[PDB]
Amino acid sequence: CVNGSCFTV
Amino acid sequence: GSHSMRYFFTSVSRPGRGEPRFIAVGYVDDTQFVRFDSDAASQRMEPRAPWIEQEGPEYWDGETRKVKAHSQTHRVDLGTLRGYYNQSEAGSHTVQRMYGCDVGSDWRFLRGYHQYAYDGKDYIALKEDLRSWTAADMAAQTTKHKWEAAHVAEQLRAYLEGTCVEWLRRYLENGKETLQRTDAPKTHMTHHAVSDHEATLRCWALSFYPAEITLTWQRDGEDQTQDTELVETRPAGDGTFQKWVAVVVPSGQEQRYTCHVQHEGLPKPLTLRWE
Amino acid sequence: IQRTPKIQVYSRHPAENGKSNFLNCYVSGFHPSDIEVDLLKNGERIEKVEHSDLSFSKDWSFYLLYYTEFTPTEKDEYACRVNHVTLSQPKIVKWDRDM
Predict the structure, then answer these.
(1) CB contact at 8 A, C78 and C38
(2) Contacts of B57 (CB under 8 A, 6+ apart)
């Protein structure tokens, strides 16, 4: 199960 | 024995036309169980091991949604990094991310990781305590400060210690007939003359699982590396692995030489001899 | 950074002529991911080779397994052809029963 919250560099 | 769940993500920019090529795979230990390929028609996360097919439509819809979000995050990232590193739009570039978790023999959280690369080099990585970041250069320092401010690490740790371990636990159980089964290496030795006076002894380990293994040659009970050869461990294609190691010896003296095999599936290391 | 692929050609099972088997070409250690891999029978391309899903090792180098079914004979020659940006020339590795 992958996450879940995505944030960019 | 510990177990791991890892997810591997590769995005490659396509400067000539369109969105980046994006490929995601998920693993438990050395067993791939899911994939996503942007070039494929389904645009779905897809099963790659039988025991994950247990999951229902809602699992696949959820994974598909998240992995698609992942692809876009990486697309954005390729743009941002081009900017950081002052690159033209002419060149194709690569972002890789790997993250995941380990459980120990107590089936509890053991460790977590989250690592990011640009063009095949370290960029930024979560540290082992999952609260801070290792930034490789000054561009990564920007990312580090941005991520500290938004406390991404706290959110990741929550994933790595909760959801991640919980689902590794679930997979380990559902797939126990394979995932929790060790395949001891099937070993043998071959022998052939290279001359009237020399011969090559090759120690084979086949069909073993997991990949971790050590083959060592000894002469009269001491490690020998000289005049030996070897191959890196390789997938057989059926979910198991292969390795061999060879020494060249004076013929008639084969009995001095032993091959020693260490593997998880072997209670005690194995000693092979010619005869 | 560019890394060149290392290459292994081998059988999934002990090679016996007359017996169906699988021919493997394992490419690893390479960067970037773009790579062309063909399996050849007597110098000529086997038409539907499959490959694994692209993944990478901890040093971020990529690896792929290419494979197809085949039945060894004693006269037949098998090889693997690899082209990468690192390679001036497409590299060909012949299959040897004993690796």
Answers:
(1) no
(2) none
Spell out the domains of chain C, with CATH numbers in brackets.
1-99 (2.60.40.10)
Which of A1, A6, A9 faces B163 most closely, judged by CB atoms? A1
Q: Answer whether C12 sits within 8 Å of B237, measured CB to CB.
A: yes
> What is the rounded radius of gyration, in angstroms, for the C-alpha atoms of chain B?
23
The method of structure determination was: X-ray
Q: Say how many domains are in chain B.
A: 2
Contact B190 C98 (CB under 8 A): yes
Rounded CA gap, B51 and B61, in Å? 17
Residues sharing a CB contact under 8 Å with residue B58, sequence separation 6 or more, in sequence order: none
Cα–Cα distances (Å) from C30 to B34, B36, B51, in that order, read 23, 21, 31
Structure tokens at B225: 């590396």
Chain-centre distance for alpha carbon B74: 21
DSSP element (H, E) containing C90 = none
| Contact exists between A and C (3 or more beta carbon pairs < 8 Å) | no
CB within 8 Å: B163 and A3: yes
Residues B15 and B139 in one domain: yes
Nearest beta carbon to residue B8 from set C26, C56, C67: C56
Residues of C in contact with B10 (CB under 8 A): 33, 54, 56, 62
Report the alpha-carbon distance of residue B77 to residue B93 in Å, rounded.
Answer: 11
The DSSP call for residue B254 is: G
Do both B11 and B109 map to the same domain?
yes
Closest CA in chain A for residue B55: A1
The pair of three-digit structure tokens given for residue B163, joined into one six-digit string: 């959801």
B10 lies within 8 A of chain C by CB: yes
